């Protein structure tokens, strides 16, 4: 969402003096008509891209790119504007463009692209491209837009992203569930680099049934920095019942990100 | 203020070979429909909506060629110019641009394919600048089109009145009124397969025209279908047919 | 005259069979052009190939060909000609 | 999909009906050519017109048509093209 | 001892435009026959008998052109020359004149029309000089012509062995051997009209190749005829069919 | 069968000197082969013509014409010959031709015509045209022929011919058969301009039968010149029988021509 680098942006393409600016958004609706409204763009697409930072923090970014249309309307082109809209958080940013010099159709190709925006995983992204001047009232549209599906960090490529590890999926807790003594189970697993509490939900179900005979919760206090990357051991006494042999145990972190909403790892023991 | 000025030309357009650096848009919309002028002939009414908001600052004309394909091959078209250039992108009075032209006579039972493009045309290695629509003409069986000379000569106007009744178990009697147009007729009787067949030759009856044709039939002919075919010379072997029914004769 | 064979080309095997007639001229390219005159007034029966079935109708198809002519030495003239390619089996039109 | 109508041109009334496809090009006379594709793998029945009859086979017919092409102003060249015209009913070939 | 040297040319003959005061006769006789070259191609052997007793004192060559027409159009021909000048009417050694030329490739199932005339040609407003003969080629159902690469793909050399017996009153079972060339087949049963029908799809069987196809039949199916039609891709819809017969399978 | 008369015969055509002649024929040992013998003629036909005579002997004649091909053989043409052959009497005559100078094909049409021979009525005539030189042994023939049919006397135009006037079909006898008394018949008719006897053949048949009850012959003597074109009256007594009412009477001359073979006029009287 937030812009990545404050270095002078480069949009230079052969024979042009282009500038990029984050001006006022005003969503996608504004009134400023004029005599001639140029034509619509063509073949706009967005691609997935991966890049690190100066510190090396690999962030996911999008490769937005689009083509032109061939007609005399290229003579009267003046500007363009890029917008990004969020369906879930309703927060929308905007990008401003221009063309300091007039363009002639000289070589039969013209390309535009940009990849300077970080996207959030598992979020739909809306990108729209507009051309200036804006349409005169009661005129043909000059803007097109499409969707963008972003997977979750559990995917291999999405895994190695730096923003993931803050409540991420690369942290695989080695789950060791031992039968141990009768009516007693011992669970051991490794935890991550965050000083936030965990929780264990031990639920026992009868075989071939989803109902629960006995459900127990265990609270794991806030870890100390010295205890990072060390297996934590919890032993729990099970219900003394026959037929409720199926036990479901799950771990839920409470990291700074996705707090109360991060993924849970459930292990099933059946007899 | 522009208008339309249509003529005729088939072949190579002089501006196709020459290259153009700037090209116009396309035909935003295009519709065609048939309109009839009478006191026979039917003509074509084609209306198109021009490009909007751009791509019109330069434009010369439009071409419309149409191909008909039924028992033949046909291809001819007319190119029209625009008298004055365009200053605006929509009519100052109001509404989108709309022109039309009347012509391109129509035959019977022929499918027409209509296409058009703007001028000058697109250079090589560019997008397909065309849009096309299709339309089928009515036939001769319809009520409106029974009075053309060709159909009446083939017998659209004719009223061959048939009364065929089962003469006996193995033969059936057919009565039908003759015409000065023809002299020979066939006969078909269909229930599940051919149950009877014949071929007759009788001259014109200025006398009373009630026929006396007897045809042998195999099996029970009750409830069959009587089909009559006339050998009118002008339609060749493809002459229109008329239905008949089997009735019971005491 | 209404018969269908088993082998050979289409004209001896099609349901609406056509034969080839001779057109002769001295100033035409080619000299000989062979039109189609399909025989039976109606299409033949599929079950036997030797009798006639009256439920169908026969109709020629035409196409325009490129031929050259002579005209007074000589002159080069290019105009089309009307020839017949093949007949097809079409369904009847019935009124009432 | 195999059906026979009662009126209209031959393509909707022939025993072996054919539709028209589109061959679009930028440098050809004409711009659009319309070939023929036989919709039914076999010939339809005479008695009804809406069902199929397996005792037949469907085949196309071709002919050479004069068209023009351009090639690098520009230059004009002449070359023939292969375009399908009509499907016809043909009898089967048997061995034994 | 004149000989004939032949080469290929299609189009306008240069003598047609010019005017000729004197013209020769015509071809007296013409025959066309096919020949086969040892291995695989088919070429046509032509022969003509030149005119007698006169009208050969001046002459140049003899053109032949051939038109073939089946599912296609065809036209291509060669004008072939003569080398020596002609001084006499018949052979000095004796007998009439017998020439020939080998060529003009032959396709399958195409009717051929052969025509010819002498050179230079008749001027405008004169008699029609030419004479023509017709010829037809065999198909792919003859023993001597089962082995083109073209027709093998259609299954000319295939040995589809079939066995169809009446399972019960309403069912008849068909046994047949599959091929790596085909994947889908029809099944037609004809006694008076259609009594049964089906459509099957089975791949190649490197295992035992005895088939099992169940087809419902209407009425007594004894004594009917069983036809099979394979969808070999090369032949499209014109793939050759192989006949069969229905027998009785006894329960015993 | 005989040439009409001896006068310098005209065969000339533009750019040609021609001669006519009658001489030996029948091609007895006509093996005269030379090197390169021209082609055969083309489109030979014979027409019918009637020619008058100074004294009035109108004669029917055959008009023979023929054309030529257009090969190079016209250079080596040298001669021609015409033959007329009879079938029944086998009497046959020939007439020869010649072209003095060499003819060059300048324009495309040439014709040869001739009708100076009288044909006999109701006879079959064969006309053959030959070109010189004669063919070599084992060579292509260069001669064509045709059959010609002559109508008999009763034809409209053949009626007025004078060879038919001899034993004239124009001699029409007004036959007057009067019943007169019972068992007696009187017949009167006119006769022609020759002193030739006439025989009356009166035959009586029963009705619906071809057998003859009574047949009688009457001799009319040789007429005198004063009796020419005057009705001759002969009365005959008929048989006294019942049912033999049908009588056939026929008259035939014994003229100088067709003697014993001239046609008869039979009149039938039925009761
Ligand atoms: C078809 O022809 C028949 C015969 O001409 C017509 O039958 C006549 O019917 C009327 C009653 O409306 C009777 O009065 C006549 O006597 C009938 N004709 C004869 C010859 O008896 C019949 O009406 C005709 N129908 C049409 C539609 O033309
Ligand atoms: C069909 O036409 C025939 C004659 O062409 C009709 O037959 C006559 O019908 C009348 C009606 O009473 C009789 O009086 C005649 O005796 C019939 N025969 C003739 C030769 O006239 C017949 O009625 C007509 N109609 C039908 C249904 O057959
Ligand atoms: C077709 O296939 C059948 C079976 O595949 C062949 O039948 C074989 O016949 C021989 C003697 O004729 C037996 O010894 C075999 O046991 C049979 N095979 C079986 C039963 O699987 C048959 O020969 C083949 N050819 C023909 C022409 O029918
Ligand atoms: C046709 O094929 C079927 C199987 O494809 C044959 O049926 C087999 O018959 C043998 C005995 O003859 C049994 O041992 C097999 O078990 C059968 N096959 C199956 C799958 O059960 C049949 O014999 C063949 N011939 C016919 C029907 O005439
Ligand atoms: C175009 O500009 C002129 C200014 O000269 C103005 O008068 C006119 O209203 C404008 N038209 C449109 C459609 O903007
Ligand atoms: C956990 O610890 C560091 C420091 O907080 C964190 O930046 C990193 O993502 C984790 N370490 C590793 C090795 O992944
Ligand atoms: C958990 O148990 C394992 C094996 O018994 C041991 O290696 C590990 O040190 C234990 N962890 C703690 C925190 O006691
Ligand atoms: C358009 O103008 C050209 C140039 O004069 C002319 O040849 C053509 O016929 C015109 N089109 C019409 C009149 O439809
Ligand atoms: C084709 O032939 C028809 C025959 O009437 C003729 O009318 C037509 O002009 C020709 N050319 C085309 C392109 O249809
Ligand atoms: C053609 O159709 C349009 C709309 O259907 C109609 O307004 C017009 O009057 C018709 N005729 C002409 C000549 O445009
Ligand atoms: C012909 O018209 C129908 C009408 O719906 C359309 O669907 C079809 O695409 C048209 N055919 C072609 C070749 O454009
Ligand atoms: C026949 O003669 C012509 C005229 O010179 C020549 O061009 C042609 O090549 C000859 N044909 C051959 C040599 O096959
Ligand atoms: C027609 O087109 C075919 C394409 O297969 C080509 O072989 C042939 O030479 C062309 N001309 C004729 C006269 O067949
Ligand atoms: C062609 O056929 C003739 C006729 O029998 C034969 O003499 C000749 O050898 C054959 N082949 C050639 C090349 O002429
Ligand atoms: C084809 O050849 C046969 C040989 O008997 C002949 O009768 C027929 O006339 C020929 N066909 C043509 C169109 O010349
Ligand atoms: C033709 O003329 C030549 C001239 O010397 C002669 O030798 C030859 O025998 C002649 N041919 C005949 C007589 O058949
Ligand atoms: C009969 O008399 C003369 C002498 O025989 C003959 O020439 C003439 O033709 C005949 N008379 C008439 C009137 O014909
Ligand atoms: C024959 O009789 C008729 C009438 O009786 C008469 O005019 C004629 O003179 C008679 N003929 C002779 C030769 O007496």
Numbering used by the authors:
A (entry chain E), F (entry chain F): 33 to 303
B (entry chain C): 19 to 57, 62 to 272
C (entry chain B), D (entry chain A): 73 to 144, 154 to 177
E (entry chain D): 19 to 57, 62 to 274
Give me lines lifted from the publication on this model.
The IL-17 family of cytokines and receptors have central roles in host defence against infection and development of inflammatory diseases. The IL-17 family of cystine-knot cytokines consists of six members: IL-17A–F, which exhibit differential binding specificities to five receptors, IL-17RA–E. The most well-studied IL-17 cytokines, IL-17A and IL-17F, are produced by T helper 17 (TH17) cells and are elevated in the context of inflammation. IL-17E (also known as IL-25) is a key regulator of type 2 immune responses and driver of inflammatory diseases, such as allergic asthma, and requires both IL-17 receptor A (IL-17RA) and IL-17RB to elicit functional responses. Thus, IL-17RA serves as an organizing hub mediating IL-17 family signalling at the membrane by acting either as a direct receptor for IL-17 ligands or as a co-receptor.
With the goal of obtaining the IL-25–IL-17RB–IL-17RA ternary complex structure, we mixed excess purified IL-17RA with purified IL-25–IL-17RB before vitrification for cryo-EM. During initial 2D classification, we observed classes of particles that appeared to be the IL-25–IL-17RB homodimer with IL-17RA ‘wings’. Data collection and refinement resulted in a C2-symmetric map with a global resolution of 3.66 Å and confirmed that these particles were indeed IL-25–IL-17RB–IL-17RA ternary complexes. The ternary complex consists of a 2:2 IL-25–IL-17RB homodimeric core flanked by two copies of IL-17RA. Notably, the IL-17RA molecules do not directly contact IL-25, interacting solely with IL-17RB. The D1 domains of IL-17RA and IL-17RB interact at their membrane-distal tips through highly complementary surfaces. In this geometry, the membrane-proximal regions of IL-17RA and IL-17RB are separated by approximately 94 Å, rather than being in close proximity as seen in other classes of dimeric signalling receptor such as cytokine receptors and RTKs. The IL-17RA–IL-17RB interface (BSA = 570 Å2) is mediated by complementary surfaces composed of IL-17RA α1 and loops 1, 3, 6 and 8, and IL-17RB 310 helix 1 and loops 2, 4, 7 and 9. The interface is stabilized by core hydrophobic interactions near the centre, with a primary interaction mediated by IL-17RA α1 burying into a groove formed by 310 helix 1 and loops 2 and 9 of IL-17RB. The IL-17RA–IL-17RB interface is further stabilized by an extensive network of hydrogen bonds and salt bridges.
